[PDB]
From a paper:
In archaea, early branching bacteria, and amitochondrial eukaryotes, the reactions are catalyzed by a much simpler enzyme, 2-oxoacid:ferredoxin oxidoreductase (OFOR). StOFOR2 and StOFOR1 possess domains III (1a–228a), I (228a–500a), and II (500a–627/628a) of the a-subunit and domain VI (1b–305b) of b-subunit but lack domains IV, V, and VII. The TPP molecules of StOFORs accompany a Mg2+ ion around their pyrophosphate group and are buried at the interface between the a-subunits and b-subunits.
STK_24350 (a-subunit) and STK_24330 (b-subunit) have similar domain architectures to STK_23000 and STK_22980, with high amino acid sequence identity for both subunits (59% and 71%). The recombinant protein showed broad OFOR activities toward pyruvate and 2-oxoglutarate; therefore, we designated this enzyme as StOFOR2. However, StOFOR2 has less activity compared with StOFOR1, due to its relatively higher Km towards both substrates. In contrast, StOFOR2 easily formed high-quality single crystals in solutions containing ammonium salts as the precipitant. We could solve the structure of StOFOR2 by the single-wavelength anomalous dispersion method using a selenomethionine(SeMet)-labeled protein crystal, and we determined the structures of the ligand-free (2.1 Å resolution) and pyruvate-complexed (2.2 Å) forms. A database search using Dali server indicated that StOFOR2 is structurally similar to MtOOR (Z-score = 39.1, RMSD = 2.6 Å, and Nalign = 346 for a-subunit, and Z-score = 21.4, RMSD = 2.3 Å, and Nalign = 206 for b-subunit) and DaPFOR (Z-score = 37.6, RMSD = 2.7 Å, and Nalign = 346 for a-subunit, and Z-score = 19.6, RMSD = 2.6 Å, and Nalign = 222 for b-subunit). StFd was modeled into the large pocket of StOFOR2 by aligning the two iron-sulfur clusters onto those of the Fd-like domain V of DaPFOR. Cluster I is located 14 Å from the sole [4Fe-4S] cluster in StOFOR2, and the gap is filled with loops near the clusters. Loops between cluster I in StFd and the sole cluster in StOFOR2 simultaneously provide a protein-protein interface and an electron transfer pathway. The loops from the two proteins mainly interact via hydrophobic residues, involving the side chains of Ile46 and Pro94 from StFd and Pro13b and Phe18b from StOFOR2.
Residue numbers in the entry:
A (entry chain B), B (entry chain B): 4 to 304
C (entry chain A), D (entry chain A): 2 to 628
Write the structure that this text describes.
Amino acid sequence: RKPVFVDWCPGCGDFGILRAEEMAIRELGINPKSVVIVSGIGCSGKIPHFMNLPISGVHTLHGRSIAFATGIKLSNPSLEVIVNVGDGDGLGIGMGHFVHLGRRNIDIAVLVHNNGVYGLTKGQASPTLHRGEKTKSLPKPNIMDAVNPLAVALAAGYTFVARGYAYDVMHLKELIKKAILHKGSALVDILQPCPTYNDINTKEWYDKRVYKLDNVPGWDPVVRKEEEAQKKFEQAIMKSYEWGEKIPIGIFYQNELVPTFEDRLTSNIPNYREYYPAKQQIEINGISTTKIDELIKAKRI
Amino acid sequence: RKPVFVDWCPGCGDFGILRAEEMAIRELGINPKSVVIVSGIGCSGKIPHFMNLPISGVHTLHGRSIAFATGIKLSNPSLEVIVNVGDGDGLGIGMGHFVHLGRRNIDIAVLVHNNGVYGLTKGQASPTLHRGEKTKSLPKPNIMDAVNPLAVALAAGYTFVARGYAYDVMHLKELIKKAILHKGSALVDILQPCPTYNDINTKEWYDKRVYKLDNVPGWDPVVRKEEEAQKKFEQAIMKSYEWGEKIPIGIFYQNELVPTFEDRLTSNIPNYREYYPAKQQIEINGISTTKIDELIKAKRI
Amino acid sequence: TRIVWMIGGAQGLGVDTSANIFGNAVAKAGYYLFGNREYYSNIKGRHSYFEVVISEKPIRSLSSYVNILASFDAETVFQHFTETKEYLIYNVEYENTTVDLVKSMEPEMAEQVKEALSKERLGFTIKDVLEYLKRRGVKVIGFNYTELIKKIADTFKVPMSVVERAKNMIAVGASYGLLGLKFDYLKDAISSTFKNELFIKFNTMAAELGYNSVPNVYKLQEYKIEKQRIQVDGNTISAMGKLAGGLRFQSYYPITPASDESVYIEANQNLDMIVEGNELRKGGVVVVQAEDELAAINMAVGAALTGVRSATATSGPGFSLMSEGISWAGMNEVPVVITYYMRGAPATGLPTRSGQADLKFALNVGHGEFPRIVIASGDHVEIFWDAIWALNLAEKYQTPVIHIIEKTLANAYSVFEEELITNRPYVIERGKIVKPTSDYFNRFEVTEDGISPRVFLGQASIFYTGDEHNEEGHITENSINRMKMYEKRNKKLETADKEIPEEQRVNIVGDADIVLLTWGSPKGAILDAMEELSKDGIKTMMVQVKMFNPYPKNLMKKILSGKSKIIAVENNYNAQGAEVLAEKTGIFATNYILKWTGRPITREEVIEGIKKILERDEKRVVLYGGA
Amino acid sequence: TRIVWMIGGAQGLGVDTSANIFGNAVAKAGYYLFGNREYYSNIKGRHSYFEVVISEKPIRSLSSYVNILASFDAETVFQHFTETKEYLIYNVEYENTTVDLVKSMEPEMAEQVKEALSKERLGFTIKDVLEYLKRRGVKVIGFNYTELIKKIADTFKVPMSVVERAKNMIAVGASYGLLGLKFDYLKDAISSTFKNELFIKFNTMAAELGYNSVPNVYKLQEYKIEKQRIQVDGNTISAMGKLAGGLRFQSYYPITPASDESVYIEANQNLDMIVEGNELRKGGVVVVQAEDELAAINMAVGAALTGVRSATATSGPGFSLMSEGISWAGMNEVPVVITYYMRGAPATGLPTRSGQADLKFALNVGHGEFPRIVIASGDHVEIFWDAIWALNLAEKYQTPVIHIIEKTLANAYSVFEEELITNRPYVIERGKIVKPTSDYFNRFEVTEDGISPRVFLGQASIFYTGDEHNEEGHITENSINRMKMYEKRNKKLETADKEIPEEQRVNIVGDADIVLLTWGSPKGAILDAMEELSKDGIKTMMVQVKMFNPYPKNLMKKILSGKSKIIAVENNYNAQGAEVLAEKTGIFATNYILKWTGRPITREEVIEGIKKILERDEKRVVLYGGA
Ligand SMILES: Cc1ncc(C[n+]2csc(CCOP(=O)(O)OP(=O)(O)O)c2C)c(N)n1
Ligand SMILES: Cc1ncc(C[n+]2csc(CCOP(=O)(O)OP(=O)(O)O)c2C)c(N)n1
Ligand code: SF4
Ligand code: SF4
Ligand SMILES: [Mg+2]
Ligand SMILES: [Mg+2]
């Protein structure tokens, strides 16, 4: 009935992301009824349910949020569609759909909860955990290399790639805002402590290491002309591999010059923005409004 | 019964790849009985069936060759396991498994038949076809951006990344040999004309554009010490995006210093190389040879 | 009249196009057609063949025999000679070609050919085939295709390689000549098909040469066509029905023989619409080519959440991949239609052939209990009306609907009266849709009929979750909520079963002691078999199930009581439709006629199979003809 | 004796560990146990509870009532008071806590609590619960857990937060005290569980304080244990059986409650082996954590191709994703076992709860017709022997085998005699394996029994393909090869059905006119129900199906003829096992007892459900107790 117990472990980084995402949506002034948060399976995946605002939640299948989101956004592009997935969900089982989103450049933001583990199934190594790392949840050192979500996203190629941190809420909030406004597919890889599993990549570990690309004089990740694109992309790639003592946070790359999938649909469906599938009137008093006369005429003997 | 009709379109690039792969296997002297070619679904996927030698073929499910190959190789690591997939198969539906192979660094070679299309289903755009391209098989320009198989492989990270060309058989042959000998996961992205669909990226189009990284003085893609690894990797990335008038072919990156998955298994299973699953004697006259005594003893009251 | 024409040739030679031209000519003369396309999983070089049944009356089924076989290669002769009854058109150049030199031919087929010839002491050359055929009263008409092509090249002052494909139209022109219809229909069909003057004219000459070299044998007259006729394939007809039913989102991954449906939708995606106050608007169907079937199912389900009518289409391998997504749609009570173009399985199976082997999987797809509404079309007209129906069922019961269209129907085409798909209203029932009265709407209200009031994304705050949930859509493990919500969803099927008349779930034809129990594509062959058998004293009735879930349990118990023969006819090994009857009612079929070779069941296969069951009560008749 | 103990508390407080210590003490005293674990889809803060049945005889089933409820929070009182029969241990600090202040509690449960209290005019505080319980003769024992923890902190000169978890052992020590068994067993169980001296000693003091504050009520005596006993859960027992059966490759993707099986295999993967000439060797099981279930199924199938015995394990969502891979394994005749830990579905469903709602999906998984051998274990000992059996069936019939183990069994644990799983030979039958006599081996030879001679990769040139194929494994569309090869594969099931005795496919207990028709986990509760009912005049028999495919059709027809009551007892809504009987034989169950709430069916639920059917013939009894 009315209450939803916010059931995350006390001190989970997910509290920061939730707080930041709510605030991004408010401050942008978007009507909440029009916001759909599409989320995966895991601790991460529970996030729409815990939202304060009258947003809608669609809690999906493990690794399938992007496919759901795509159907939702393309059917009704007036919805503001944001995807929240776990790192196992989004980058493990959902890897294929994660990459293919980049090719489409649909206007969606994807927020990855990067805790290094599968929280909800008791802390098996996620695809972001480095080889050799042994959290308290692992019997043996991680047998797998990590994937760098930012590098895969760039190679895919997402047109907005950023990394945030759950314990810098104001910064994260501002990244989420920009990821939402970006015209195309946006990734925010969010560094997020799981205090229950992952006693390595803790709050204190990150506090010590993260620096803002925003505080780097002349760091400009925005492509403004086509000829800038390659240099901006390679500068994004290089930065995306900085890891040990220094960890950059901020926007690695943004190119709003690439047409969105919605822009490409408009080439084939000229009134798509004005009369998209979800707005269309398909019946009047239970009688179809679609004419297939010409279709049938083309088959006449 | 005895004949197999080699049913590819006359002048298909697949003839070059077949010829090159056969020759690589012969010249390396590997016993053919020990070679397993695991292939996907499409024109590409038919390749083991057309092989001259007593190799084995395992023709799988669409995009699933890598998962099959992984089970095969890890169960019997004395097999030489080579994977042949189409670009739609390997990089479309199989994308997730393609990336996760890089994290494992299993000793396998993966050969991608890059024709830009789905040959076998009548030439829909593959994940390698550029946005805006319109082959004779497409009613409208391709609505999708391409993925660069080499860049995704590097970000994944495959430890041997190369590109070949089906109409330079000797070169391709030598790349396949090196991909096979490489200790870890190797990719060869093979540029391969489909004359039936794809009247853009033809034989004459490529002949005109391809140059060998082998003919670039001082091009050295081999990591010999750990400190070389980052520079070698970034030099691979940069090169992997060269496309219009000039198209590089050859080895972009090779690092045999990363442990193979088989090396990591050996840490947990100390005699794996000598007594791997497929060599093990599990029964004597129909009676199990496995002792679970100690397992049961641990549960005693 | 009922004449069976076939032509064949290596894939890549445009022989399909030649068949289309032939049919189009005969049709304009006032004959109905039923045609088929049989190809290998192959782009070039394998053997393809094209059967066209010709009649003055509507045609319903294919045949096991060929009246006229048109050929220009050796292989097409070797592949069909045993079925050829009246006329072979062939190429004299291959008279000495032996079956072992046909390299594009599967070794198994070479063996079947040698066996059929050796058996009566013939060798393995085309010349030996000619003798085989003359022993059966077949007339053979041999053409020097090389000389005729030289003649045409000469006339048009081009090299021979330019006009090589005229071989096709010589074979066609000679076939059409045998029929005796006037040349103009063919001339017109050539001019409307080819797109350049030179190709038109040299193909027209090729057809003339064929037509004027053969006698008028069948003496066919022309019929004035009263009511407007159309010619359509199964794929296309499903697309038309969906569009008529309000579809505005389809996501798909290419697979044979499902892709053509989506390609047609996309090519026609900007639809005319008569909207509020008789305004002409255009409305676009968004069509997305997904990256795999997991994306395809889930894209469509997400789209449905916005209130759009959504669907996908697939075949066995793809459908297996969709299981999870279908289960999520069941749990979240999401309308979606999945058009299941059922093909030769398991695994890749026979990607270019047909089957009925996936019915029980469809009935039980994915984990959990939820209403899977399942229908299957038995002929081309049913496909249209069934696609409208699927979409209404999905929104009315808020659940996935599976619409089975076998490959046999999908790729076959027929000529029928246009009014059969325009004569009744296109009804769109949106089910229990409401306008929310505040900012927060409880999506899963527990009602007596199981069907919760529905609102779309953007209208109010709603929640969907794969987990068990309360009326608000929030994750709830509570045992009593679980009891109620899990029952509510399954109760929708009982409501469906009370609301849908059982008579709409079956077609019954005849009233006799011998029942032909079937579903899907055998409908046609069965009805044609019943007519033939009736003329010979043998009285039969057909019971064709259209809706397997909810199953017409009471109607079936009533129609089958006291029947002494219940013969299940299906394109599978286990007679899965009969198995479903048995689960629902206790009634076991007495006999079976089954085919699992991938090729359509023919009229004669049914006639002979039934004779074989009446004459000697054999339990299972196993069919294998074609290709 | 049969005493039901329960403790509960917020997930994350180690209450599961407390339950383990309690049980381990009672067991060393010579009592058998059957215990359960009930958690939310949640890492911290939700309500978890742990039921342990205690008896001098083997125990088979859980109960609807609790003799002793041990608690240290408000929530555990509110969640279980209506089931509590004899003793409540509780925390006096929450006497005034009202149900609305328990924020970790689902709103639906708060309503159920208020309803049960309001109904007899009580308010909503713990104090009101105490009155509810005293009206039913329950004795309550209130502890100031705060003072006792202060005392212990003081004694050990640490702050209170260091010893906060001793609350658990006060509740446990008081419970164990009521039983009257000697303290040393508990003291020993504490010392063997905790790993540091300080934690041992302050938990030992916590348990002493509890034990010495309560009277000896149940007056239990100790039993000498004759035959060696073990204590194991379902997961673990499946792992043991697989390893005994020769498994050397398992690939999996984590999912509850399947993961624990693979984690145990991996932790024990280096196995002792007595090999040729009595040599001690170690042999490693390769365990791979795949990236998703599509990788997991296909990895295992690929492994099997090398001759390794391979398997995976999963649950509903994962199993749906494996459909395609299972179909490919059917087509290519690949031995593989899939352990189906069946849980609360559809979709994510109830990831931490149980169900029987996926049986017919398992029976029909994936496109095409091929032999899907399906078994289901009904208790912990059966799990072991069934896992050996699955692996032998897979290699003998060269086909996927699905071994169903419901979550209820997987996570429950029991004490039983070790000899039940060591007393017979561990038989490994490898089926029709041969040494190839040349470089090229035809993998799919067509034989009369359907089973083709098998060779492994590396021994000779072989071919597998998802497409239809000839005897060599090459792609073949030929109709007659198709006919033969498709039949050959399905004939293997008929061979299985002739070879496997039907008596091994069912367990029959009793001989009476009233049949309890079941499968899986209700076995235990049913057998315990039959014993109780027998003492009261009411004569029943159990028919428990173990192998659903091939189905024991003839045996079932024989055992059920002339029975007047056939009552299907299953944890699903549609009684899918009854539906399968009906499909195979025509026999319809007369009545149903069904539960779809996710919690185990109890002994009393069966007793009362059957009384309710004898007394008033109601068609469907719907159960809902627990949690
Ligand atoms: C197909 C499928 N397989 C497995 C699962 C079980 N499962 C649920 S959540 C999860 C992992 C969650 O990890 P992540 O995506 O990193 O989210 P987190 O809990 O760490 O936020 C798994 C393996 C499922 N729901 N579906
Ligand atoms: C799950 C599934 N979906 C769809 C198909 C149909 N299919 C077969 S091959 C193919 C595409 C082949 O393209 P590519 O992998 O590029 O190989 P190519 O033919 O171009 O060498 C498709 C879509 C299938 N076999 N399985
Ligand atoms: S487990 Fe890790 S991720 Fe899940 S809630 Fe607890 S802390 Fe957050
Ligand atoms: S279609 Fe393209 S890829 Fe397939 S065989 Fe013909 S040419 Fe080669
Ligand atoms: Mg995570
Ligand atoms: Mg390709």
